[PDB]
């Protein structure tokens, strides 16, 4: 909505569509699509470089350096499967109700735009301070590539830095527990109580 | 892009990779000599990830097969699936080998055919400018697959340092020791190379094969013709995110990265339930996903001989549960809901655990688009029971004066036996230390 | 659309003009431009017209055995300007598509007047492609004949590298800017004319076609930053050429007197201090003419380094049209 | 106009040029003895660029074929494609030669038939008043193609100085050295003439042929009848801009000018993927151009035996990617978009690189107007590995006292062996120096 990106790139995709198909997939709807593509590409952009660093390391202080990375990788592999799965089940639910109901066109237009507002609110989850910890997560990626170019005090600086986002993860988990018991927050509790029994 | 070169090697490694390529044509909708079905591109969205990319819509396999015994390759060319293989990539007609049964035979034959063994297998490397890695589809049983396979784990570590190494290696059989007696020697020599000269392995026990081969398969005389049926399905099952279009961990460096805790701890437990053809008549009533992963953590489909009373002091760290084909994904989060209530996996007390579930659509085929399939890639710390089984059979044999004079005549001058013993105990001690 | 196809094929003449003024086919214009060059090196005279029509008719026969059947050669002629005879002669020659009757209904005075402007840049693009073909063959011609001197072996070697930097940068730029504007406009007009059903939509698709392409080829009121740098590389490519055979010729004739003086050494024995003094004079003229070619090369590559840097910034300033596509392409060429 | 005279020479050079002319009639829609199809002028817009121009619509080939062995030409006249050849341009019936197997045989036979060898091959030169050049379709293997081919690289350099020279020469096989042993001697003597007495070459390795001949072709006994199938297609593929109507680099002096960095660096790597006939059943679904050039830079289709771990310190300078036939040119700039993101070609740090792509319409034929074809003409600086392979096999043979007394009896009085060794090392040193 009125927010900005979480990196350096102004890159996004926009779909080109004309009449009378522009009546149902709006140009306002493309802007709602333009916010979710920036979020999902960026955490995928993280997953690529982090995985490459892990494979390079694969190919004690070094056992503990592998211990922080595998803990942080398994944290970010689980949360992004949750975002992939719990987007996807509103996707099959939004597919089925266009098959169940469809008798008017402004209805299935407003059916679709109310779905993007659910996807936008799930990606507006990183509004107050979470976009700062994803950038603080990214600054310890590039601090770990600054020692990829260097091959221990550097490793315990990473243990201090990888315990820094851990205490901020519980801060974001504490921010996940605060509203008036709405459904998207109840959605983000059971997914993160999934992250609690581990 | 994501091209992997399979290194099929040995008497058993060539036969388990022969039907692995034969499994791939039945699911891609292609024939080994032609293209008669149009189901290859509309149904399957990606085919050039294990095959070589096409020149005439003929997907060449990216495979090499070397063995000292010519018997395994003479049972290939009369089969109609050998015309898909090329007679110029590996060998032409009438290829041979040694005499030959020794671990020191193939270990000494690697540096006398050193010019030819690094010439024709490197021609497939520069076909793609971004190589994925190398999988050594070799064997531990015998001296053929264990003798020469230990050499390529060393010289491909520095000539190709930025490539993934991970093997689907089969473990030998420990029932009696009459036909072979050199089994504790050649196994531990390769097992040292599998931990420090190799990143990951996929263990496949032989004593656990006939536990399953008489479980539901109902045979009376165990033959070698059944060893290729359990192995070739789970090989193609492991690349369903990689061959078929998936999203997350769709590479081989995606799956192995999310399961290995540390180097020298990479031995992954495998599980695969559906192997019966008369289950097909009752899967028409919407058999769900809520019952297929309750039996994966239950020790019934496992292919690892381990202790039954040793799981209380051992803890799971990483467990993979792969569903394939029809999943009904509106209840796949419902299946993962029931995991925390049972706590069938013991969790590590020092750090978090992870139950990763993933899906990919299967082949457009009637036995594949109807029956649910579950592939397990576990990682449990009770795997030292096999390492305690192999080490207790190793030090007992050296006190009986067995193969100490019959083994050190060729290319062995110093005692490298305790070099394998301490490094095996380093693995066994760091496993129990890993849960603090 | 019956009248279009039963006689005076208008849609076929839309395609037939692209092979000549847009230069869609090369085997026509190259078998022209080979024969056309020995006439263009001299300045134009009053007898300039009568022979090029014979150079035209021989060259459209050497490339065709079936193009006699349509009416295209009668509807194409030659076009010369009123420029005084004290010019180079290269800029006078141009081909034009002639119209007489109902073909002149779809083709007005405003159409071919802009086709002269799209031809002169594209003729100069093929002019730069063929005179640099001559100097590339001139690289391999003189180098094979001067083998025997150890000094001049490494002297041509670094000259061939710094010439190759200008060869590869002109090639990946000039081949790509014309083929792309060929791509976006052939697939815009030719597929649209058979799906719209009119006369006025044939021309409405056409009269938006022929001014999209030239605005992407050369000419716009805001494109003064385009041609100022494309002509700054057009005269630097002449300055690099004429200085080469001003120094390759001085490198080759001086070696021819050395070899024939060697032949006089064996005949004087079958049939000496001044003979050594003339050889030392040869070596001194070999000595002078190597920094003569060096010093001109240090001036040339400093100009080319100033051209390649000024070509980037002065392409990236106009008023918010498809220049983001144009600025995408030149950084891709110099780096990859 | 653009007439090229092919110089087919030797035991192997005559057979690879025999099916090269036989390939040209199937794509021009013409018969070697008549004109039965009208597809020759409406479908193909240019035919008189390799053939001689017509007198009765009979496109004579501009070819000459000399060899010491009469066996290669006696397998020609019984084939029905020999009536297109003329029995007065080269030889009449019962032509012979030497005995004969020596490099010094054909090197000494060039100046005793000096009057006749420069008489009938010059009659085709003045047929067109603007000659393109000469291609020496000769061989390096044996003493027949290497002995006489080194003579014409010298006397045609000054008698025809303003003509392009560039050859499609085949490299010999280095597997064992039993049948031939003179292979390091006759190869390096011609390789010196290929760099200073010749502008460009097109290398064609023999050990890389059977790498492809068993890759997708599935043969058991490698015969000589397969060596003409990989070679004749890429010869006609290289002239698709020249034979079929193209626009840019539509001449042979167009293509070679945009790839050679410098003299004595002209060895071009070749690649060609589509060689399989069962790919045809799945190209009906609009197989695109976005996937065909991702595998060209990937080292899979290469015909050059080179090192796999030597590409990190070597850099590409010029790479050609030729698509043919159906291209769908609205996505050909989309294929070149994806090149910079992978950086599969290492770029030179001193200057710019270039990925040149071009297209031309193929023959009006059903296997040609349906399946995508990709021809690669690379130029990578790892080509010194072959020059290190040939030089290490050259100095090792001179220390074994091999062919030093058996080779200098005829027309050799001084040691010209180190004259070839230093000039080969000059090529190998200037290649690594070229990236500063």
Numbering used by the authors:
A (entry chain Z): 605 to 663, 673 to 764, 821 to 867
B (entry chain l), D (entry chain m): 2 to 437
C (entry chain d): 545 to 815, 821 to 885
What does the paper say about this structure?
The γ-tubulin ring complex (γ-TuRC) is a structural template for de novo microtubule assembly from α/β-tubulin units. The isolated vertebrate γ-TuRC assumes an asymmetric, open structure deviating from microtubule geometry, suggesting that γ-TuRC closure may underlie regulation of microtubule nucleation. Here, we isolate native γ-TuRC-capped microtubules from Xenopus laevis egg extract nucleated through the RanGTP-induced pathway for spindle assembly and determine their cryo-EM structure.
The cryo-EM reconstruction of the native MT-capping γ-TuRC purified from X. laevis egg extract was at sufficient resolution for spoke-wise rigid-body docking of atomic models and thus to discern conformational rearrangements at the subunit level. In contrast, the last four spokes display an increasing deviation, witnessed by a pronounced lateral movement of the γ-tubulin molecules around and towards the helical axis, approaching—but not reaching—MT-compatible geometry. The separation between γ-tubulin molecules in spokes 1 and 14, measured in the plane normal to the helical axis, is reduced from 4.7 nm to 2.5 nm when comparing the isolated γ-TuRC with the MT-capping γ-TuRC. Consistent with incomplete conformational closure of the γ-TuRC, spokes 11 to 14 continue to display deviations from MT-compatible geometry of up to 1.4 nm in distance to the helical axis. Notably, the actin-containing lumenal bridge of the γ-TuRC is partially destabilised. While the two MZT1 modules part of the lumenal bridge are well resolved, EM density for the actin molecule is significantly underrepresented as compared to the X. laevis γ-TuRC in the open conformation. We thus combined both datasets and obtained a cryo-EM density of the MT-capping γ-TuRC at an improved resolution of 17 Å, which was used for further analysis.
